[PDB]
Write a structure and sequence with these properties.
The PDB classes it as oxidoreductase. Keywords: Cytochrome, lignin, CYP255A, Amycolatopsis, haem, oxidoreductase, vanillin. The assembly is monomeric. With about 400 residues, the chain is of the alpha+beta class. The chain is built from 15 helices and twelve strands. It has one domain. The chain has helices at about 15-20, 20-30, 45-55, 65-70, 80-90, 95-115, 125-145, 150-165, 185-205, 210-215, 230-260, 260-270, 275-285, 315-320, 355-370, and strands at about 35, 40-45, 60, 125, 290-295, 300, 305, 310-315, 375-380, 385, 395, 400. The strands form four sheets. Strands 1-2-8-5-3 form a five-stranded mixed sheet, covered by helices on one side. Strand 6 (about 300) and strand 7 (about 305) form a beta hairpin. The longest helix has about 30 residues, at about 230-260. The protein binds protoporphyrin IX containing FE and 4-hydroxy-3-methoxybenzaldehyde. 4-hydroxy-3-methoxybenzaldehyde binds near residues 241, 242 and 291.
Length: about 400
């Protein structure tokens, strides 16, 4: 235990979930690599340390403890070597930029219009539940082959998987403090199996253009498929973060723009600024905030800390994206910030595989929203609360407009 960081003993899980930024501002100043007792792990808080650990040849991927309890093996985020190379080759075809550009407009734009048509004449909406989450999950769900799983159910699954994956608190003995918090993750997985096992049964015999059918068949010898137990943990990686994060990124970008009314007006007037607005939104409140980890494979010194081999490090990219060594007043959303590198998609061999897809989903969703409701305003009678330490986003976004 590091004596001058004794204050970290009093940091709680609830504190980090409600707002981790004050603790992490102290960490970036006091100890860019620091052991946080309630998380049971070293955490990297600065951009330099997050990027170094994420790309270091002396580290490899590992899943956080609660993440591993939730996903098992082999989750693409948690493996290396040949298995990782196979799983990357499995997921990459539909995510290739030239491929995304062939069909992303016809996928996302009709979905956005469908959800907008339900409320665009109402004068009020809660955009997280009514727009941002549905567009994110329906787009990816259709791409995967889950057309028949309703968006309400996809949203429920990623919320349960989120809470299980981030159920990270440990007690005085380093044991999980809230073992009951994994139950809803296990229940979500059981429901997912009941729905997806018959789909995999069908795709094995009758492949189609769905991504999960291609995960089963691509690159395999004739008549063979990847075993479903081998692909299910990466299905869960998708049914949590890939389903959740474009909606979080959309919503955080909107909250940021509302906080700068002149900039919201600029973007509505000139939708070519939407990509820049989203990039700033991801830096400003990173959807994947501290869910990623690496483990050292040999003894290494990071930020003055001598780590033995086998030391996990949580990568708190959401804190790295407020590093004041890089950014002026990072807690303010600013569309006109110069476009600098950011870590909201991670870094290294395990960096996000779906960046190009995700950016287009968010872009098209905001384009259609501003076209349908150009006089969109935040409902300032309602507060916007952000929640989450592992994954972070606004829990609601009440808006109003003149009808
Ligand atoms: C704005 C929304 C999104 C954000 C902020 C995002 C951010 C990330 C981050 C931070 C990681 C960890 C990278 C690292 O290890 O350093 C990540 C891994 C990944 N993301 Fe994204 N993601 C986003 C949308 C997606 C979507 C929609 C998909 C799928 C279509 C996607 C597929 C992946 C995969 C497969 C991995 C694991 C890569 C590996 O471990 O090799 N992500 N994402
Ligand atoms: C792309 O989805 C995920 C990413 C991560 C960590 O970066 C953790 C769980 C996920 O489901």
């Amino acid at each position: 235990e590091r004596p001058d960081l004794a204050w970290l003993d009093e940091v709680t899980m609830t504190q980090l979930e409600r707002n981790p930024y004050e603790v992490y501002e102290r960490l970036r100043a006091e100890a860019p690599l620091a052991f946080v007792p309630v998380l049971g792990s070293y955490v990297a808080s600065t951009a330099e340390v997050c990027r170094e650990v994420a790309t270091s040849p002396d580290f490899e991927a590992v899943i956080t403890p609660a993440g591993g309890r939730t996903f098992g093996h082999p989750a693409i985020i948690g493996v290396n070597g040949d298995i990782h190379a196979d799983l990357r080759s499995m997921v990459e075809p539909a995510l290739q930029p030239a491929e995304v550009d062939r069909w992303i407009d016809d996928l996302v734009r009709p979905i956005a219009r469908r959800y907008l048509e339900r409320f665009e004449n109402d004068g009020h909406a809660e955009l997280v539940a009514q727009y941002c989450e549905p567009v994110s999950v329906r787009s990816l769900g259709d791409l995967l082959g889950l057309q028949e799983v309703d968006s309400d159910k996809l949203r429920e699954w990623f919320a349960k998987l989120n809470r299980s994956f981030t159920n990270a608190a440990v007690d005085e003995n380093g044991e999980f403090a809230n073992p009951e918090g994994f139950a809803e993750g296990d229940q979500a997985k059981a429901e997912i199996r009941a729905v997806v096992d018959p789909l995999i049964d069908k795709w094995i015999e009758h492949p189609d253009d769905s991504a999960i059918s291609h995960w089963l068949h691509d690159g395999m010898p004739p008549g063979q498929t990847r075993d479903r137990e081998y692909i299910y943990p990466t299905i869960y990686v998708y049914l949590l973060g890939a389903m959740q994060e474009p909606g979080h990124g959309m919503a955080s970008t909107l909250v940021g723009l509302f906080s700068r009314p002149e900039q919201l007006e600029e973007v509505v007037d000139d939708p070519t600024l939407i990509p820049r607005a989203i990039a700033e939104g991801l830096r400003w409140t990173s959807p994947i905030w501290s869910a990623t980890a690496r483990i050292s494979t040999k003894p290494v010194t990071i930020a003055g800390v001598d780590l033995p081999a086998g030391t996990p490090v949580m990568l708190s990219y959401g804190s790295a994206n407020h590093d004041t060594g890089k950014y002026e007043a990072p807690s303010q959303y600013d569309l006109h910030r110069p476009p600098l590198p950011h870590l909201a998609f991670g870094a290294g061999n395990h960096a996000c595989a779906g960046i190009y897809f995700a950016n287009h989903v968010m872009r098209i969703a905001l384009e259609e929203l501003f076209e349908a409701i150009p006089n969109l305003e935040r409902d300032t009678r309602e507060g916007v609360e952000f929640w989450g330490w592992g994954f972070r986003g606004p829990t609601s976004l009440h808006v109003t407009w003149e009808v």
